[PDB]
Ligand SMILES: CCOc1cc(C(=O)N2CCC(N3CCN(C)CC3)CC2)ccc1Nc1ncc2c(n1)N(C1CCCC1)c1ccccc1C(=O)N2C
């Protein structure tokens with residue numbers, strides 16, 4: 001699928017890179033460390049943990065056949081943050097800014 005491969009390349013080379021270099025992205029660059037953060041319930045409440053490194057590795061290993069599968073993982077990462085945390089939390093403020101950037105860059109993904 002040439003079109004799907006081109007869209008996945010855009011997600012890897014543009015969207016992922018733009019989120020990664022954003023100054024708020026660091027908490028999302030590795031899976032949540034429930035021990036370090038003292039969150040003994042995180043991996044019970046969050047049923048599909050997700051982070052930018054997991055997405056990066058999936059792109060690198062050709063894990064996705066379609067762009068929608070990769071977009072789903074970005075959406076899960078943000079959704080998880082909002083499910084576990086509370087309005088007004090530092091991480092929720094960071095996530096909202098990152099998600100705005102995500103939507104902007106995603107809207108420029110080639111459509112055909
Ligand atoms: C592997 C390292 O990991 C962490 C380290 C540190 C840390 O002290 N360093 C790191 C940043 C350093 N600077 C800051 C930027 N500077 C411009 C350059 C260098 C200085 C000190 C803090 C949190 C970490 N890890 C985490 N990973 C997921 C989450 C997460 N923290 N946050 C916090 C991130 C900050 C707001 C809250 C959560 C906390 C509680 C519950 C959930 C979540 C949550 O949802 N996420 C996604």
Ligand SMILES: CCOc1cc(C(=O)N2CCC(N3CCN(C)CC3)CC2)ccc1Nc1ncc2c(n1)N(C1CCCC1)c1ccccc1C(=O)N2C
Nearest residue numbers: 067071072074075100102103104105106107108109110111
């Ligand atoms: C912030 C802007 O907002 C969007 C706008 C437009 C748009 O109108 N055009 C038409 C005009 C195009 N220009 C404008 C400048 N110029 C002068 C030349 C013409 C730009 C694109 C499309 C998607 C948007 N924003 C979005 N935000 C989250 C999602 C999202 N689209 N997609 C789509 C983006 C990639 C494929 C699907 C979703 C769609 C349905 C269900 C879920 C999701 C989903 O998961 N996400 C995360």
